[PDB]
Design a protein around this ligand. Structure first.
Ligand SMILES: CC[C@]1(c2ccccc2)CCN(c2cc(C)n(CCN3CC4(CCN(c5nccn6cncc56)CC4)NC3=O)c(=O)c2)C1
Lengths: 212, 213
Protein backbone atom coordinates (compact mmCIF):
# COMPACT_ATOMS: atom_id res chain seq x y z
CA UNK A 1 0.00 0.00 0.00
CA UNK A 2 1.08 3.59 -0.62
CA UNK A 3 0.91 4.39 3.11
CA UNK A 4 2.34 2.22 5.88
CA UNK A 5 0.28 1.22 8.90
CA UNK A 6 1.30 -1.32 11.53
CA UNK A 7 -0.75 -4.45 10.87
CA UNK A 8 -2.12 -4.63 14.42
CA UNK A 9 -2.56 -2.90 17.77
CA UNK A 10 -4.23 -3.90 21.03
CA UNK A 11 -5.35 -2.67 24.42
CA UNK A 12 -7.58 -3.68 27.28
CA UNK A 13 -10.86 -1.89 27.98
CA UNK A 14 -10.22 1.66 29.16
CA UNK A 15 -6.67 1.91 27.80
CA UNK A 16 -5.57 4.14 24.95
CA UNK A 17 -4.02 3.01 21.67
CA UNK A 18 -2.18 5.07 19.06
CA UNK A 19 -1.78 3.72 15.53
CA UNK A 20 0.44 5.36 12.93
CA UNK A 21 0.23 6.06 9.21
CA UNK A 22 3.52 6.88 7.48
CA UNK A 23 3.89 8.31 3.98
CA UNK A 24 6.20 10.81 2.28
CA UNK A 25 6.45 14.59 1.99
CA UNK A 26 4.35 14.46 -1.20
CA UNK A 27 1.34 12.78 0.44
CA UNK A 28 0.97 12.59 4.24
CA UNK A 29 3.50 15.37 4.70
CA UNK A 30 2.34 17.56 1.82
CA UNK A 31 -1.07 18.71 3.04
CA UNK A 32 -3.56 18.36 5.89
CA UNK A 33 -5.64 15.79 4.04
CA UNK A 34 -5.32 12.65 6.20
CA UNK A 35 -8.51 10.71 6.83
CA UNK A 36 -9.16 7.71 9.05
CA UNK A 37 -11.80 5.03 8.46
CA UNK A 38 -13.18 2.41 10.87
CA UNK A 39 -14.50 -0.95 9.66
CA UNK A 40 -16.04 -3.73 11.69
CA UNK A 41 -15.48 -6.95 9.69
CA UNK A 42 -18.14 -7.48 7.03
CA UNK A 43 -19.83 -4.12 7.65
CA UNK A 44 -19.58 -0.86 5.75
CA UNK A 45 -16.62 1.30 6.81
CA UNK A 46 -17.12 4.72 8.37
CA UNK A 47 -15.20 7.98 8.17
CA UNK A 48 -14.05 8.89 11.68
CA UNK A 49 -11.35 11.52 11.00
CA UNK A 50 -10.80 13.92 8.11
CA UNK A 51 -8.35 16.76 7.52
CA UNK A 52 -6.02 15.14 10.06
CA UNK A 53 -7.96 16.07 13.20
CA UNK A 54 -11.66 16.65 12.36
CA UNK A 55 -14.36 14.33 13.68
CA UNK A 56 -17.57 13.92 11.67
CA UNK A 57 -20.79 14.45 13.57
CA UNK A 58 -21.60 11.55 15.88
CA UNK A 59 -17.98 10.36 16.27
CA UNK A 60 -17.01 10.54 19.97
CA UNK A 61 -14.12 12.73 21.09
CA UNK A 62 -12.05 9.80 22.32
CA UNK A 63 -10.99 9.49 18.66
CA UNK A 64 -8.32 12.09 17.86
CA UNK A 65 -6.08 12.63 14.85
CA UNK A 66 -2.71 14.33 14.58
CA UNK A 67 0.25 14.57 12.24
CA UNK A 68 3.98 15.27 12.45
CA UNK A 69 6.13 15.33 9.34
CA UNK A 70 5.19 12.36 7.17
CA UNK A 71 3.44 10.35 9.92
CA UNK A 72 -0.21 10.73 10.94
CA UNK A 73 -1.54 9.14 14.11
CA UNK A 74 -4.96 8.03 15.30
CA UNK A 75 -5.37 7.84 19.08
CA UNK A 76 -8.36 6.02 20.58
CA UNK A 77 -8.79 6.89 24.26
CA UNK A 78 -10.69 4.74 26.73
CA UNK A 79 -11.05 1.70 24.49
CA UNK A 80 -14.56 0.29 24.40
CA UNK A 81 -15.74 -3.03 23.02
CA UNK A 82 -17.11 -1.38 19.86
CA UNK A 83 -13.63 -0.06 19.03
CA UNK A 84 -12.44 -3.55 18.07
CA UNK A 85 -12.21 -3.09 14.29
CA UNK A 86 -9.86 -2.44 11.38
CA UNK A 87 -8.66 1.13 10.88
CA UNK A 88 -7.43 2.59 7.60
CA UNK A 89 -5.81 5.90 6.80
CA UNK A 90 -5.66 7.82 3.54
CA UNK A 91 -4.01 10.94 2.22
CA UNK A 92 -4.12 12.95 -0.95
CA UNK A 93 -1.05 12.11 -3.02
CA UNK A 94 0.69 13.14 -6.23
CA UNK A 95 -1.01 13.93 -9.54
CA UNK A 96 -4.57 14.02 -8.16
CA UNK A 97 -4.40 10.63 -6.46
CA UNK A 98 -5.68 9.06 -3.25
CA UNK A 99 -3.26 6.96 -1.18
CA UNK A 100 -4.37 4.38 1.40
CA UNK A 101 -2.78 2.56 4.27
CA UNK A 102 -3.03 -1.19 4.53
CA UNK A 103 -5.14 -1.20 7.68
CA UNK A 104 -4.50 -1.80 11.37
CA UNK A 105 -6.50 -4.44 13.24
CA UNK A 106 -7.24 -3.10 16.74
CA UNK A 107 -8.09 -5.76 19.32
CA UNK A 108 -9.72 -4.94 22.63
CA UNK A 109 -8.24 -7.80 24.65
CA UNK A 110 -10.85 -10.38 25.62
CA UNK A 111 -8.34 -12.81 27.19
CA UNK A 112 -4.61 -12.91 27.99
CA UNK A 113 -2.13 -12.24 25.23
CA UNK A 114 -0.24 -15.30 24.02
CA UNK A 115 2.74 -15.45 21.68
CA UNK A 116 2.58 -17.91 18.76
CA UNK A 117 4.27 -21.27 18.66
CA UNK A 118 6.06 -21.34 15.29
CA UNK A 119 7.20 -24.55 13.56
CA UNK A 120 8.73 -24.60 10.07
CA UNK A 121 8.65 -27.86 8.08
CA UNK A 122 10.96 -28.55 5.13
CA UNK A 123 9.72 -30.49 2.11
CA UNK A 124 8.44 -33.97 2.82
CA UNK A 125 9.96 -36.85 0.91
CA UNK A 126 6.68 -37.87 -0.72
CA UNK A 127 6.04 -34.42 -2.20
CA UNK A 128 9.66 -34.16 -3.38
CA UNK A 129 9.09 -37.38 -5.34
CA UNK A 130 6.02 -35.63 -6.79
CA UNK A 131 8.10 -32.62 -7.97
CA UNK A 132 6.83 -30.34 -5.19
CA UNK A 133 8.84 -28.68 -2.41
CA UNK A 134 6.12 -26.87 -0.46
CA UNK A 135 7.20 -25.62 2.97
CA UNK A 136 4.77 -25.11 5.84
CA UNK A 137 5.11 -22.65 8.72
CA UNK A 138 2.73 -23.69 11.49
CA UNK A 139 1.69 -20.91 13.89
CA UNK A 140 -0.44 -21.91 16.87
CA UNK A 141 -1.71 -20.88 20.30
CA UNK A 142 -1.64 -17.10 19.92
CA UNK A 143 -3.88 -14.24 20.95
CA UNK A 144 -4.95 -11.76 19.61
CA UNK A 145 -5.74 -13.59 16.38
CA UNK A 146 -3.73 -11.16 14.24
CA UNK A 147 -0.46 -12.26 12.68
CA UNK A 148 1.64 -11.19 9.71
CA UNK A 149 3.88 -13.71 7.97
CA UNK A 150 6.80 -13.01 5.66
CA UNK A 151 9.07 -15.49 3.90
CA UNK A 152 12.70 -15.15 2.84
CA UNK A 153 14.82 -17.00 0.27
CA UNK A 154 18.26 -16.76 1.84
CA UNK A 155 17.88 -13.12 2.96
CA UNK A 156 15.68 -11.90 0.09
CA UNK A 157 11.93 -11.37 0.55
CA UNK A 158 9.82 -13.93 -1.31
CA UNK A 159 6.29 -12.90 -2.31
CA UNK A 160 5.47 -15.42 -5.04
CA UNK A 161 3.95 -18.70 -3.94
CA UNK A 162 2.99 -17.56 -0.41
CA UNK A 163 -0.40 -18.36 1.09
CA UNK A 164 -1.46 -17.90 4.71
CA UNK A 165 -4.74 -19.09 6.19
CA UNK A 166 -7.05 -16.83 8.15
CA UNK A 167 -6.36 -17.44 11.87
CA UNK A 168 -9.13 -19.47 13.51
CA UNK A 169 -9.88 -20.13 17.15
CA UNK A 170 -9.01 -23.68 18.23
CA UNK A 171 -10.22 -25.89 21.08
CA UNK A 172 -8.01 -24.09 23.64
CA UNK A 173 -9.57 -20.72 22.61
CA UNK A 174 -6.32 -19.44 21.08
CA UNK A 175 -5.67 -18.93 17.38
CA UNK A 176 -3.85 -21.04 14.81
CA UNK A 177 -2.95 -20.62 11.15
CA UNK A 178 -0.54 -21.98 8.55
CA UNK A 179 1.58 -20.32 5.90
CA UNK A 180 2.88 -22.40 3.01
CA UNK A 181 5.40 -21.49 0.34
CA UNK A 182 5.02 -23.41 -2.92
CA UNK A 183 8.55 -24.10 -4.13
CA UNK A 184 9.83 -26.31 -6.91
CA UNK A 185 12.44 -28.91 -5.95
CA UNK A 186 15.02 -26.90 -7.91
CA UNK A 187 14.30 -23.76 -5.86
CA UNK A 188 14.54 -25.64 -2.55
CA UNK A 189 17.76 -27.48 -3.34
CA UNK A 190 19.57 -24.46 -4.82
CA UNK A 191 19.18 -21.92 -1.98
CA UNK A 192 21.18 -21.85 1.24
CA UNK A 193 17.95 -21.67 3.26
CA UNK A 194 14.39 -20.41 3.52
CA UNK A 195 12.92 -18.58 6.49
CA UNK A 196 9.44 -17.91 7.87
CA UNK A 197 9.01 -14.62 9.77
CA UNK A 198 6.03 -14.34 12.12
CA UNK A 199 5.14 -10.96 13.65
CA UNK A 200 2.67 -10.92 16.55
CA UNK A 201 1.94 -8.07 18.96
CA UNK A 202 4.88 -6.33 17.30
CA UNK A 203 7.38 -9.19 17.69
CA UNK A 204 8.74 -10.85 14.54
CA UNK A 205 9.78 -14.44 15.26
CA UNK A 206 11.84 -16.19 12.56
CA UNK A 207 12.48 -19.85 11.77
CA UNK A 208 14.89 -21.16 9.14
CA UNK A 209 15.33 -24.47 7.29
CA UNK A 210 17.84 -25.69 4.71
CA UNK A 211 18.21 -28.78 2.52
CA UNK A 212 19.77 -31.86 4.12
CA UNK B 1 -25.54 9.50 9.27
CA UNK B 2 -27.61 7.71 6.62
CA UNK B 3 -26.13 4.88 4.61
CA UNK B 4 -26.34 4.74 0.85
CA UNK B 5 -28.73 2.04 -0.38
CA UNK B 6 -27.23 -1.16 -1.81
CA UNK B 7 -28.94 -4.53 -2.27
CA UNK B 8 -27.44 -6.93 0.29
CA UNK B 9 -26.82 -9.59 -2.37
CA UNK B 10 -26.43 -10.19 -6.10
CA UNK B 11 -25.32 -13.15 -8.16
CA UNK B 12 -24.17 -14.43 -11.52
CA UNK B 13 -22.75 -17.48 -13.25
CA UNK B 14 -19.19 -17.51 -14.61
CA UNK B 15 -18.91 -15.54 -17.84
CA UNK B 16 -22.16 -13.69 -17.10
CA UNK B 17 -22.76 -10.08 -16.08
CA UNK B 18 -24.15 -8.53 -12.92
CA UNK B 19 -25.22 -4.94 -12.25
CA UNK B 20 -25.57 -3.61 -8.71
CA UNK B 21 -26.93 -0.23 -7.67
CA UNK B 22 -26.14 2.42 -5.09
CA UNK B 23 -28.94 4.91 -4.35
CA UNK B 24 -28.20 8.11 -2.43
CA UNK B 25 -29.73 11.60 -2.29
CA UNK B 26 -29.46 14.79 -4.32
CA UNK B 27 -26.75 16.09 -1.95
CA UNK B 28 -24.47 13.05 -2.20
CA UNK B 29 -24.67 10.56 -5.11
CA UNK B 30 -26.93 12.93 -7.03
CA UNK B 31 -24.92 16.04 -6.22
CA UNK B 32 -21.53 15.46 -7.83
CA UNK B 33 -19.45 12.81 -9.54
CA UNK B 34 -17.55 11.75 -6.42
CA UNK B 35 -18.92 8.18 -6.40
CA UNK B 36 -16.44 5.39 -5.72
CA UNK B 37 -16.71 1.61 -5.58
CA UNK B 38 -14.56 -0.78 -3.57
CA UNK B 39 -14.18 -4.53 -3.76
CA UNK B 40 -13.41 -6.50 -0.61
CA UNK B 41 -12.71 -10.16 -0.12
CA UNK B 42 -13.75 -11.23 3.40
CA UNK B 43 -10.93 -10.75 5.89
CA UNK B 44 -8.78 -8.73 3.49
CA UNK B 45 -8.00 -5.12 2.74
CA UNK B 46 -10.37 -3.64 0.12
CA UNK B 47 -9.43 -2.28 -3.29
CA UNK B 48 -10.90 0.86 -4.85
CA UNK B 49 -12.12 -0.27 -8.27
CA UNK B 50 -13.99 2.86 -9.47
CA UNK B 51 -13.62 6.55 -8.67
CA UNK B 52 -15.35 9.63 -10.08
CA UNK B 53 -18.32 7.43 -11.09
CA UNK B 54 -16.63 5.66 -14.00
CA UNK B 55 -12.82 5.71 -13.71
CA UNK B 56 -10.86 2.54 -13.08
CA UNK B 57 -7.50 2.86 -11.28
CA UNK B 58 -4.44 1.17 -12.71
CA UNK B 59 -4.71 -2.62 -12.57
CA UNK B 60 -8.52 -2.89 -12.46
CA UNK B 61 -9.79 -4.90 -15.47
CA UNK B 62 -12.12 -3.20 -17.91
CA UNK B 63 -14.76 -5.78 -16.93
CA UNK B 64 -15.75 -3.25 -14.21
CA UNK B 65 -17.89 -0.34 -15.43
CA UNK B 66 -19.42 2.41 -13.31
CA UNK B 67 -22.17 4.83 -14.26
CA UNK B 68 -24.71 7.12 -12.61
CA UNK B 69 -28.26 8.25 -13.33
CA UNK B 70 -29.79 10.79 -10.99
CA UNK B 71 -29.31 9.66 -7.39
CA UNK B 72 -28.33 6.08 -8.31
CA UNK B 73 -24.84 4.90 -9.20
CA UNK B 74 -24.41 1.48 -10.78
CA UNK B 75 -21.57 -1.01 -11.11
CA UNK B 76 -21.63 -3.66 -13.82
CA UNK B 77 -19.24 -6.62 -13.67
CA UNK B 78 -18.94 -8.42 -16.99
CA UNK B 79 -17.44 -11.85 -17.62
CA UNK B 80 -17.81 -12.96 -14.02
CA UNK B 81 -14.83 -14.89 -12.64
CA UNK B 82 -14.41 -16.65 -9.29
CA UNK B 83 -12.21 -13.80 -8.06
CA UNK B 84 -15.17 -11.41 -8.43
CA UNK B 85 -17.01 -13.16 -5.58
CA UNK B 86 -16.67 -10.45 -2.94
CA UNK B 87 -18.34 -7.61 -1.09
CA UNK B 88 -18.77 -4.37 -3.05
CA UNK B 89 -19.20 -1.01 -1.33
CA UNK B 90 -20.08 2.36 -2.78
CA UNK B 91 -19.28 5.76 -1.32
CA UNK B 92 -20.09 9.37 -2.13
CA UNK B 93 -18.92 12.67 -0.70
CA UNK B 94 -21.66 15.08 0.26
CA UNK B 95 -21.54 18.47 1.93
CA UNK B 96 -19.85 19.41 5.18
CA UNK B 97 -16.92 17.05 4.52
CA UNK B 98 -19.24 14.06 4.99
CA UNK B 99 -18.51 10.74 3.27
CA UNK B 100 -21.47 8.39 2.85
CA UNK B 101 -21.15 4.63 2.40
CA UNK B 102 -23.48 1.97 1.14
CA UNK B 103 -24.08 -1.10 3.24
CA UNK B 104 -22.33 -3.38 0.76
CA UNK B 105 -23.48 -5.90 -1.82
CA UNK B 106 -22.17 -9.46 -1.59
CA UNK B 107 -21.81 -10.69 -5.16
CA UNK B 108 -21.83 -14.48 -5.40
CA UNK B 109 -20.37 -16.20 -8.43
CA UNK B 110 -22.57 -19.27 -8.73
CA UNK B 111 -21.45 -22.78 -9.66
CA UNK B 112 -17.72 -22.52 -9.06
CA UNK B 113 -15.67 -25.60 -10.00
CA UNK B 114 -15.38 -28.38 -7.45
CA UNK B 115 -11.82 -29.26 -6.51
CA UNK B 116 -10.34 -32.07 -4.47
CA UNK B 117 -7.78 -31.17 -1.78
CA UNK B 118 -4.06 -31.38 -2.22
CA UNK B 119 -2.90 -33.10 0.96
CA UNK B 120 0.71 -32.98 2.16
CA UNK B 121 1.76 -34.61 5.43
CA UNK B 122 4.92 -33.38 7.14
CA UNK B 123 6.77 -35.35 9.82
CA UNK B 124 8.34 -33.58 12.80
CA UNK B 125 11.02 -31.07 11.92
CA UNK B 126 14.53 -31.52 13.26
CA UNK B 127 14.41 -28.24 15.19
CA UNK B 128 11.21 -29.08 17.06
CA UNK B 129 12.48 -32.56 17.98
CA UNK B 130 15.54 -30.97 19.60
CA UNK B 131 13.03 -28.79 21.49
CA UNK B 132 11.32 -32.00 22.67
CA UNK B 133 8.28 -31.56 20.41
CA UNK B 134 6.96 -33.80 17.61
CA UNK B 135 4.03 -31.87 16.11
CA UNK B 136 2.87 -33.16 12.71
CA UNK B 137 1.16 -30.96 10.14
CA UNK B 138 -1.24 -32.09 7.39
CA UNK B 139 -1.53 -29.25 4.87
CA UNK B 140 -4.83 -29.32 2.97
CA UNK B 141 -5.06 -26.89 0.08
CA UNK B 142 -6.79 -25.94 -3.16
CA UNK B 143 -10.14 -27.61 -2.42
CA UNK B 144 -13.65 -26.34 -3.12
CA UNK B 145 -16.23 -25.98 -1.65
CA UNK B 146 -14.66 -25.21 1.72
CA UNK B 147 -15.88 -28.08 3.91
CA UNK B 148 -13.43 -30.78 5.05
CA UNK B 149 -13.16 -33.31 7.86
CA UNK B 150 -9.86 -34.73 9.09
CA UNK B 151 -9.08 -37.96 10.94
CA UNK B 152 -5.67 -39.10 12.18
CA UNK B 153 -4.26 -42.60 12.70
CA UNK B 154 -1.45 -43.89 14.90
CA UNK B 155 -0.36 -47.01 13.05
CA UNK B 156 -3.82 -48.32 12.06
CA UNK B 157 -5.70 -47.03 15.12
CA UNK B 158 -7.76 -43.82 15.42
CA UNK B 159 -6.21 -40.91 17.29
CA UNK B 160 -8.76 -39.31 19.60
CA UNK B 161 -6.67 -36.63 21.38
CA UNK B 162 -4.33 -33.84 20.38
CA UNK B 163 -5.87 -32.95 16.99
CA UNK B 164 -6.55 -29.42 15.83
CA UNK B 165 -7.76 -28.46 12.35
CA UNK B 166 -8.09 -24.84 11.30
CA UNK B 167 -11.25 -23.38 9.81
CA UNK B 168 -10.89 -23.51 6.00
CA UNK B 169 -10.15 -20.10 4.50
CA UNK B 170 -10.27 -18.97 0.89
CA UNK B 171 -6.85 -18.18 -0.56
CA UNK B 172 -5.77 -16.07 -3.53
CA UNK B 173 -6.71 -18.81 -6.04
CA UNK B 174 -10.28 -18.66 -4.64
CA UNK B 175 -9.89 -22.19 -3.28
CA UNK B 176 -9.83 -23.15 0.38
CA UNK B 177 -6.91 -24.18 2.55
CA UNK B 178 -6.54 -25.58 6.03
CA UNK B 179 -4.01 -27.33 8.21
CA UNK B 180 -4.51 -30.13 10.71
CA UNK B 181 -1.78 -30.51 13.31
CA UNK B 182 -1.25 -33.38 15.73
CA UNK B 183 0.73 -32.45 18.83
CA UNK B 184 2.82 -35.50 19.67
CA UNK B 185 5.63 -35.88 22.13
CA UNK B 186 8.83 -37.28 20.61
CA UNK B 187 8.10 -40.47 22.56
CA UNK B 188 4.69 -40.93 20.90
CA UNK B 189 6.24 -40.28 17.47
CA UNK B 190 9.13 -42.72 17.93
CA UNK B 191 6.94 -45.43 19.50
CA UNK B 192 4.69 -45.93 16.44
CA UNK B 193 5.47 -47.36 13.03
CA UNK B 194 3.66 -44.50 11.29
CA UNK B 195 1.05 -41.77 11.52
CA UNK B 196 -1.58 -40.98 8.90
CA UNK B 197 -3.85 -38.03 8.09
CA UNK B 198 -7.10 -38.81 6.26
CA UNK B 199 -8.91 -35.88 4.63
CA UNK B 200 -12.53 -36.28 3.57
CA UNK B 201 -13.98 -33.86 1.00
CA UNK B 202 -17.29 -34.35 -0.81
CA UNK B 203 -17.41 -38.03 0.14
CA UNK B 204 -13.92 -38.76 -1.24
CA UNK B 205 -11.04 -39.44 1.15
CA UNK B 206 -7.29 -38.89 0.71
CA UNK B 207 -4.83 -40.49 3.14
CA UNK B 208 -1.16 -39.67 3.68
CA UNK B 209 1.26 -41.59 5.89
CA UNK B 210 4.64 -40.66 7.39
CA UNK B 211 7.08 -42.60 9.54
CA UNK B 212 10.18 -41.84 11.61
CA UNK B 213 13.52 -42.07 9.83
C1 LIG C 1 -12.35 4.86 1.61
C2 LIG C 1 -12.85 3.52 2.13
C3 LIG C 1 -11.81 2.38 2.19
C4 LIG C 1 -12.57 1.10 2.50
C5 LIG C 1 -12.45 0.43 3.72
C6 LIG C 1 -13.15 -0.75 3.96
C7 LIG C 1 -14.00 -1.26 3.00
C8 LIG C 1 -14.14 -0.61 1.79
C9 LIG C 1 -13.44 0.56 1.55
C10 LIG C 1 -10.69 2.71 3.19
C11 LIG C 1 -9.59 1.72 2.87
N1 LIG C 1 -9.69 1.65 1.41
C12 LIG C 1 -8.69 1.16 0.61
C13 LIG C 1 -7.55 0.59 1.18
C14 LIG C 1 -6.54 0.10 0.37
C15 LIG C 1 -5.31 -0.52 0.94
N2 LIG C 1 -6.65 0.17 -1.02
C16 LIG C 1 -5.58 -0.35 -1.90
C17 LIG C 1 -4.36 0.56 -1.96
N3 LIG C 1 -4.48 1.70 -2.86
C18 LIG C 1 -5.18 1.64 -4.13
C19 LIG C 1 -5.07 3.08 -4.67
C20 LIG C 1 -4.38 3.08 -6.05
C21 LIG C 1 -4.51 4.41 -6.77
N4 LIG C 1 -5.91 4.82 -6.94
C22 LIG C 1 -6.25 5.84 -7.73
N5 LIG C 1 -5.72 5.89 -8.96
C23 LIG C 1 -6.05 6.92 -9.74
C24 LIG C 1 -6.87 7.95 -9.34
N6 LIG C 1 -7.43 7.94 -8.06
C25 LIG C 1 -8.26 8.75 -7.34
N7 LIG C 1 -8.47 8.23 -6.11
C26 LIG C 1 -7.76 7.08 -6.05
C27 LIG C 1 -7.10 6.86 -7.25
C28 LIG C 1 -6.86 3.97 -6.21
C29 LIG C 1 -6.43 3.80 -4.76
N8 LIG C 1 -4.23 3.74 -3.65
C30 LIG C 1 -3.89 2.92 -2.63
O1 LIG C 1 -3.16 3.19 -1.69
C31 LIG C 1 -7.78 0.74 -1.63
O2 LIG C 1 -7.83 0.76 -2.87
C32 LIG C 1 -8.82 1.24 -0.78
C33 LIG C 1 -10.96 2.20 0.92
Amino acid sequence: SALTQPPSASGSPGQSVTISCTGTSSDVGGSDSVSWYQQHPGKAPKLIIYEVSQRPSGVPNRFSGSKSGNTASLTVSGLQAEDDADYYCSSYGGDNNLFFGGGTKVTVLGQPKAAPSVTLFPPSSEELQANKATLVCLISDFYPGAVTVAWKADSSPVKAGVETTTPSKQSNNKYAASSYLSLTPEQWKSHRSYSCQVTHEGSTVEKTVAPT
